[PDB]
Design a protein around this ligand. Structure first.
Ligand SMILES: NC(=O)C1=CN([C@@H]2O[C@H](COP(=O)(O)OP(=O)(O)OC[C@H]3O[C@@H](n4cnc5c(N)ncnc54)[C@H](OP(=O)(O)O)[C@@H]3O)[C@@H](O)[C@H]2O)C=CC1
Lengths: 274, 268
């Protein structure tokens, strides 16, 4: 039912428009390169000739852009068109940028919903997909039925920075795990094991943790001893030690703070302060 | 059938002996702290009075000790008793320590199999369980049927360091992921989200990667947002700074337009 505007037609934007159209919503789109909207228009989307026209077309404006700089580049020249709009900003950036953007939007008469999309574009419109949302609750409830078409809409609270925080937490785990995976493939190669032979093992190894968390001795000292073996293994192999050294540094600080006999979770205390 | 010796009766050693006994094997045991064998002896294990006696009891000697320092502490005073033995060393340590130990064992007439046990003690003897093995293939094949009583036995190659490498690879991913998890809980708290409220999300966030299993420049931009988020929050930045340093080095190598996997080159 509710028609909607989507600005930004990279891969994420494309998926969102297609999903909106699949479900019977009229969609007005805009992008810097018009040929990216061709197929979408052929499917029933309407290409606005300017950003102003995109904004005027609908109350609900969904932004799928690379970062807040891209958002401001598009919106700063058209702030006179923002009055009475609801910006569902699904672009990645920091909690503090989200907070600033919410304030700025309100200066120009618009409401701001922060969205942190948890999935890549091919999972938009699929049942198990979800997006973190934060911002004014009354505004969220008013557009929730439209936002749910893209993903489950998981409202996390009033502050504009909250959805961004959850997203950046997700990306902390994702990128760190990704590097540890690559680190292992490097270590393998330095020991004469090809990446393709080690690949299935490294892949399975990434399931240990979610399994561990689902279920769970518990002495920091034992962890520290294992981590030291990890560090020396990478040192001995001649590969980069940036990542395992950082892990060791963190365990070291816990040990130096008298946590040897405490639970692993005491590391949360270590990480709370620089 | 095959009788076996187990040296080291911490929680892992205990499980191994119990599992061997459950399956009808005669087991001879030894430990630095002799009282830890009480329960096993009460089930039929034979406590050797000396390390020499433990070694002379059997061809196959399974070691479950804290590390190689412990292994040497026990075996160095009895190097004369090692001739004709097969040491299945399941003590976790580095690949280079495993290599050095294989050479040393061979100097004293013993064969050395490196074992990297992938599971905690209660999974010993159970179907889900596996152990990485490396060392001489003929020796492995000769004792594989005994070793399979403990876990599936996954032979990875001749080099003594290999099984240890696979184990340390597993622990690289485990500990690193674990710290990223704690890092998020720290970040949550600094933003007024309690660890208990964030806990189920942080847990589901650890599945992102294996599910998920592009352009380096886009990854670098996301990682910079991660770094600044933790900086802004006032929490530790040691871990996200290290992730950023790695992405930075890739960008500085001219890999912006390459796939993420180009990071393997950066890490080599
Ligand atoms: N527990 C687990 O979940 C897993 C463990 N591993 C690995 O298995 C091995 C054994 O672990 P686990 O049984 O859990 O307990 P530990 O890692 O604490 O090992 C304890 C054993 O090592 C002995 N030991 C320690 N230092 C010395 C020394 N200087 N001289 C002689 N003996 C020594 C202990 O003797 P005493 O009893 O007299 O102190 C005991 O028999 C470790 O290498 C570990 O990393 C691998 C996979 C899973």
């Amino acid at each position: 039912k509710q028609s909607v505007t989507v600005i930004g037609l990279g891969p994420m934007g494309q998926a969102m428009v297609n999903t909106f159209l699949d479900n019977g919503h009229e969609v007005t789109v805009w992008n810097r390169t018009a040929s990216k909207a061709e197929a979408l228009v052929a499917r029933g989307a309407v290409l606005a000739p300017t950003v102003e026209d995109a904004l005027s077309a609908n109350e609900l404006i969904v932004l799928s852009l690379t970062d807040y700089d891209a958002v401001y580049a598009i919106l700063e020249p058209v702030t006179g068109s923002l009055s009475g709009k609801v910006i569902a900003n699904l672009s990645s950036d920091t909690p503090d940028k989200a907070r600033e953007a919410a304030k700025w939007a309100a200066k120009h008469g618009a409401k701001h919903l922060t969205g942190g999309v948890q999935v890549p574009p091919p999972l938009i419109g699929k049942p198990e997909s979800s997006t973190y949302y934060s911002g004014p609750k009354d505004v969220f409830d008013a557009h929730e039925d439209t936002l749910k078409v893209l993903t489950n809409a998981d409202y996390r609270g009033e502050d504009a920075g909250l959805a961004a925080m959850y997203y950046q937490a997700q990306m902390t785990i994702f990128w760190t795990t990704m590097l540890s995976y690559y680190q292992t493939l490097a270590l393998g190669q330095a020991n004469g094991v090809s990446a393709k032979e080690l690949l299935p093992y490294a892949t399975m190894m990434t399931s240990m943790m979610p399994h561990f968390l689902e279920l769970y001795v518990d002495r920091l000292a034992m962890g520290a001893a294992s981590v030291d073996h990890v560090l020396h293994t990478h040192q001995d192999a001649g590969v980069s030690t940036v990542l395992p050294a950082a892990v060791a540094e963190i365990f070291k600080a816990g040990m130096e703070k008298g946590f040897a006999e405490n639970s692993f979770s005491s590391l949360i205390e270590v990480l709370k302060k620089p």
